[PDB]
């Protein structure tokens, strides 16, 4: 018996947004400005723990040194960082629009399995609506996008790990939560899903592989495409049958 709905997280599930999108936009900005700075995968992971985009650039330059092109004055440095971040933010949206952020393996396959088999599909994210809607429309394309309901940003007051986003999706779609499967990449998103009374499959992403997925119903490195498929729609349905303790 298939799920009534599949509910996908956006960042780390549909796309490896941080590793393959935000990090790239930082590097492309730095290159365009001739700063001679590159943030590779592992360093970027560390910088993700410091703060937001402006804060992690400030911390990085304070530690390693400011670029030769940067102003020396504290107020002018703050403006320089603001400019950099505005540029990075502009570029990241351009990257989506140009289709340069790849879907994760198996995403398009799984979405199409659902849509072709009468299973509802939604996306449930804390990210801003424009980016999430852009990811879906540009990267999954307009035919799929028309069928996919988006629940993002401030549509709920209580963000993950609160279940509000998942609950809203279930209510809106008109489906029983116990018949939904959520695909998440983070421990806090998993918490939201389980608190919503849903089955949750984790697909670890670039910066979440070491998080605590004990409460997940299944954990994988990705969804995958043949001939290296990790799971499919059928498996999502199978996973609805729980193994309780008699
Ligand atoms: Mg995520």
From Swiss-Prot:
Localisation per UniProt entry: Plastid, Chloroplast
A GO-annotated cellular component: chloroplast envelope
Alphabetic keyword roster: Chloroplast, Hydrolase, Magnesium, Metal-binding, Plastid, Transit peptide
Enzyme class: hydrolase
Entry binding sites for substrate: 9, 18, 52-56, 85-88, 125-131
GO molecular function: hydrolase activity; metal ion binding
Coiled coil (UniProt feature): none
Record carries keyword DNA repair: no
Signal peptide per UniProt: none
Residues reported in the UniProt entry to bind Mg(2+): 9, 11, 185
Active site: 9, 11
Cofactor: Mg(2+)
The reaction(s) this protein catalyses: D-xylulose 1,5-bisphosphate + H2O = D-xylulose 5-phosphate + phosphate
Enzyme Commission identifier(s): 3.1.3.-
Entry function: Highly selective xylulose-1,5-bisphosphate (XuBP) phosphatase. Also shows activity towards ribulose-1,5-bisphosphate (RuBP) and fructose-1,6-bisphosphate (FBP), but not towards fructose-6-phosphate (F6P) or ribulose-5-phosphate (Ru5P). Degrades xylulose-1,5-bisphosphate, a potent inhibitor of rubisco produced by the rubisco itself.
Family, as annotated: Belongs to the HAD-like hydrolase superfamily. DOG/GPP family.
The protein's name in its UniProt record: CBBY-like protein
Lineage: Eukaryota, Viridiplantae, Streptophyta, Embryophyta, Tracheophyta
């Amino acid at each position: 018996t298939l799920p009534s709905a599949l509910l996908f997280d956006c960042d780390g599930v549909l796309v490896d947004t941080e590793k393959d999108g935000h990090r790239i936009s930082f590097n492309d900005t730095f290159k365009e400005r001739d700063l001679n700075v590159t943030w590779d995968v592992d360093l970027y992971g560390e910088l993700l723990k410091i703060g937001g985009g402006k804060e992690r650039m400030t911390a990085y330059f304070n530690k390693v040194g400011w670029p030769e092109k940067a102003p020396k004055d504290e107020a002018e440095r703050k403006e320089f960082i603001a400019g950099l971040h505005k540029q990075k933010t502009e570029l990241f949206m351009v990257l989506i629009e140009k289709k340069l952020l790849p879907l994760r393996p198996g995403v398009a396959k799984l979405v199409d399995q659902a849509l072709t088999n009468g299973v509802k599909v939604a996306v449930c994210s804390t990210s801003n609506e424009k980016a999430v809607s852009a990811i879906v429309s540009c990267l999954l394309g307009p035919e799929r996008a028309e069928k996919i309901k988006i629940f993002a940003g401030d549509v709920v007051p209580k963000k993950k790990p609160d279940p509000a986003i998942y609950n809203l999706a279930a209510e809106t779609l008109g489906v029983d939560p116990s018949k939904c499967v959520v695909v998440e990449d983070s421990a806090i998103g998993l918490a939201a899903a389980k608190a919503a009374g849903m089955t949750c499959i984790v697909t670890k992403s670039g910066y979440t592989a070491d998080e605590d997925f004990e409460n997940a119903d299944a954990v994988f490195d990705c969804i995958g495409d043949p001939p290296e498929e990790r799971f499919d729609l059928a498996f999502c349905g199978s996973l609805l049958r729980k193994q309780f303790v008699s």
